[PDB]
Amino acid sequence: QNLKSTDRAVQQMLDKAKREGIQTVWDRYEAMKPQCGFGETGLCCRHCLQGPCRINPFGDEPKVGICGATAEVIVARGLDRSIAAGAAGHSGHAKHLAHTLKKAVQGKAASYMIKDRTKLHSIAKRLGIPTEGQKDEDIALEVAKAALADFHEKDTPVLWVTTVLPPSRVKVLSAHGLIPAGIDHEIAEIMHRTSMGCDADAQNLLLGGLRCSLADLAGCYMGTDLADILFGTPAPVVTESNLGVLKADAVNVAVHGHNPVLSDIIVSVSKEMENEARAAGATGINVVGICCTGNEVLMRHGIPACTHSVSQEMAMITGALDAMILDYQCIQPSVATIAECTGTTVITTMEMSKITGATHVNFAEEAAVENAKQILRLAIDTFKRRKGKPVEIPNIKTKVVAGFSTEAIINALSKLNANDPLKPLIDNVVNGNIRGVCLFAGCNNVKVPQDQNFTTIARKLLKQNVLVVATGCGAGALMRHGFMDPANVDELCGDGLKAVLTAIGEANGLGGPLPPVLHMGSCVDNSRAVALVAALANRLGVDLDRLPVVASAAEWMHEKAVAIGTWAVTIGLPTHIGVLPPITGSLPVTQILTSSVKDITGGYFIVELDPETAADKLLAAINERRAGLGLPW
Amino acid sequence: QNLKSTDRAVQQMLDKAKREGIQTVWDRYEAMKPQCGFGETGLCCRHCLQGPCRINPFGDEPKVGICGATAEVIVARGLDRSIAAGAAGHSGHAKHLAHTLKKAVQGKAASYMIKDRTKLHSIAKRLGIPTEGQKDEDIALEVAKAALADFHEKDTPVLWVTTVLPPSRVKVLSAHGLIPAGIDHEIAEIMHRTSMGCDADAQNLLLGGLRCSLADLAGCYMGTDLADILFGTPAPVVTESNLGVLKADAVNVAVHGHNPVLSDIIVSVSKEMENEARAAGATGINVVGICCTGNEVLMRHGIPACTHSVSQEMAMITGALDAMILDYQCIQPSVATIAECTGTTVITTMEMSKITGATHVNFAEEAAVENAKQILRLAIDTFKRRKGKPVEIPNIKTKVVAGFSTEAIINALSKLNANDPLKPLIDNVVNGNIRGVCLFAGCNNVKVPQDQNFTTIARKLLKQNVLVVATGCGAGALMRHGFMDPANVDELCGDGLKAVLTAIGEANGLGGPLPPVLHMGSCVDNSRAVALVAALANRLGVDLDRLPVVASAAEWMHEKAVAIGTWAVTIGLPTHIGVLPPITGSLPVTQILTSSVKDITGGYFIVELDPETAADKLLAAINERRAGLGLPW
């Protein structure tokens, strides 16, 4: 089972699933082999009913699509649609939060409110919204209307691009025509230009894809901005992770998905109903997190993280998961079928994300508390149905220090230099105590033994004094393997990095260092890493493509992650990817994405399936940036 | 070659292509066989990097996607993305016209203007825009701003849905939650809900698809509305079609694509430059149409139609095509490679639609005349390069009477009843002179011998007194086979239909009948057929799903046509489709689309590959509607 997952709690549950005859994501993957080589290489097109078309990677016919689409056109069109689909997910998330904030300040949903006034005002200033002499709800109404306006064409480009990146970067992107005009406008234009008989030039197609990836960045940044206004900016928190955070004697309720507009309510209301749970024979309600909505409530409230991504079915296999509350994205629909065996109540809540066989509870922000109580009562009923029955919760969990929003990181640094908080960080980059910064982002992928790339690359970078930050299931992988526990700094971190984490941690009074890896939040909270890197770029007076900063989507899966990797390249980062996307069927497209895009944006994809080699390549990219600034390396 | 195309001019050019070694769309199709059965049936998913996933239609594993996506989920998700891509094409077209009208009335592009004042005012009234005491440019600015507002969420739903359909139909759709909130909003939400780990319920997925198809209908209707304001509402015109409209001694210039914002200018400017063409040794500039931009200028100006869809390469094979001026959609990218053999200058003009190897001329509405002159001068240069060389233009062409906008049809009927123009049509439906109405729409498809389904079904319906209207490449197929020539009414039309076409034609002074098939324009001009059917429904006091009206996408190919077929079903029409879309891998999805959707919208897909059987089924559907109204059949 260690060929399937490096997580020992997951391995234990894979044994339970095997002996109980419950098919898992790994079993379904095994049943899919060998996977289609045309699809693997990107040499397949189904964009019209003359298809399906395919192109042999090598050899004889077919060599070209029926309409004349070449391999490079077919590969670029498919990749563009993946980017647009990822942009659509992140921006749907952000749109839902924009409507929630508008409802809250128009008095239509009293469960929601402005919780971070300082964030609201700083966002309004960044956007150029007047704050002096304005009521908070009037400022917030204006911020929410600005968010919704970025989805369509208007007099300005997308402000959640142009106001969040350094001006030198905005000029570089503007020169290549890469600034999005509207978030949904770009998504629609990708679907148009990639339809049959439209754009048929690989360079033109990929430039459209870069622009659409910035529409995705805007959705990510908007989502983080609006969630912080509504629910609070994260600050350092202590909690736990892995399956051992489940409690056999509690009502165990997992929040799963990405949008916390509902799950934040679940956390608050669950506290209200401890007594109703206690009346049913439980110790209380144990809310636990799966995937990014789990990251959201972990970051803000210290909700323990149960599991992530590829291993999400294993939480159910314990027999102790009474409810799984879903909003949307990255939910394996298998959970609805597995629940018939494990007894878990799977609850969908979003009209556009239903699963056959799951109970649906319509959630409306206007009725959020009432909906949360109906849902938690279904969970309490389920707990009663298993009272006195044996469960198998692996007794495996890690300590997790998290909550490193960019505001939190700047605040922590300010204890070393109050008026220039970024300078202590840059000082240690320059003197070599910090070699560079690496962001781990993105998913797990059944093709990769779970967490193996994340932990292997992270171990090598940390020993080389790289400051490592993480989001999404990359943060999930690292937190489940102990990388967010400061007790592991001595074993994991090089001497220079250790000194810096210790100096910052002690100056914030902890008597101990920051954790080896800084958890920066959910997938949309990759925007937080952008805010930090952009602040560093501005403080240094350079563009992002001169900073010793790289990214690694080491085990990525989702169209959302393809979008994120692409805008990491677009804003100027060397970006490692650890699973082949469908590009190898076109050498010209591969060459653009791995080499010649350097000349457009300064970033580039680093394709490397072997994580030991990936770490070497990421260190090489970091060190080349160091040399370009004239630093020793 | 008659297995490839029933068009004799196309057959002649296929022989020329064969002996000159020029590979055609039919050759590329032959090189693709056998096509992938997973893709043909819809049982393939590439929506994340754990893929590609496939499901065996029958037999053993794989039976389910790696994430747990069932066959019905995978089939519904793929179909939804095709609808969204079609909506994105039609609405990108409409958006470009909305910006052009806004530029024109803001004094920023003097080549464009309000040419149809009556249409502008009627649209403004339909939308609730005040006209009394307003300047035309102020009304038009308001209409253009309303068009752009329908692309995003706002206080109202998409008005180019709710104001164009009968109120009973809007209520039925509203009851099922099918009214679009914004055009690009719906496209984005489809891409979101169909991404990995999101919507996983086939009925929920397909309901989203119906709503997105109405976003496509709105783009179609907006495109027709705005093009008529800018360029004039079509009225009956006489011209010719097929390859014999090319002139060996003229500069032959094809306008190809869908958006006529440029091609309408080409038509006007080409007249200006007859003398510059004559100085180069040509008789003049012979502008001819391919695909829907050809239909646009055929409908408004009588520009002869050269060819359509699947056979578009054959116009180049004559050796006489000096330029091919492209905007976007349905352009085989092969034309850029074929031009190296035929000498044609292929010119792209739209930033999001380039073809490697084609000359690009940036077109801006602000500089439209100057751009048109640069382009036509490249064409004149190309004519010079072939002076004195032999060409092979098939001496084959048909007479085409066209220009039947819905306003034109109502005007023609008004000569029989001035104050109640629809009543003469309904009178003849009731007495059986007109059995019903059939709209032929959509593409040709290399899988079907070109035009064979269109002409075979049309012949049988016309003999049974069905009033036949047509758009796009369906109009193209019928016009190239003589169905728009009134001299063929005696051979083609049943006695009752003949009497009606004769009575209307004579009352409009022609001394002769209307043509056997009424050409209603381009693919977006399917909205004209909706306007006509909705007027009939309102005059009769019933909903569209009670009218003896059907549609046939007999040889369809493009994602745009999938969208059109879906909204034909959504607004309540029995809708025949003559090529299998990728649905047969899911019986539940097939059953929803062919049977149970009747209970939602009253329309339904009729899948029939055999055109003789298709005609029987379409007559059966028409006659069932007749019986439901209590009419004899």
Ligand code: SF4
């Ligand atoms: S768009 Fe071209 S390559 Fe794609 S399925 Fe259609 S004919 Fe084949």
Ligand code: SF4
């Ligand atoms: S979304 Fe599911 S079915 Fe599709 S490729 Fe990914 S794992 Fe396979």
Ligand code: FES
């Ligand atoms: S041929 Fe397998 S992905 Fe299309």
Ligand code: FES
């Ligand atoms: S397996 Fe052929 S279309 Fe994917």
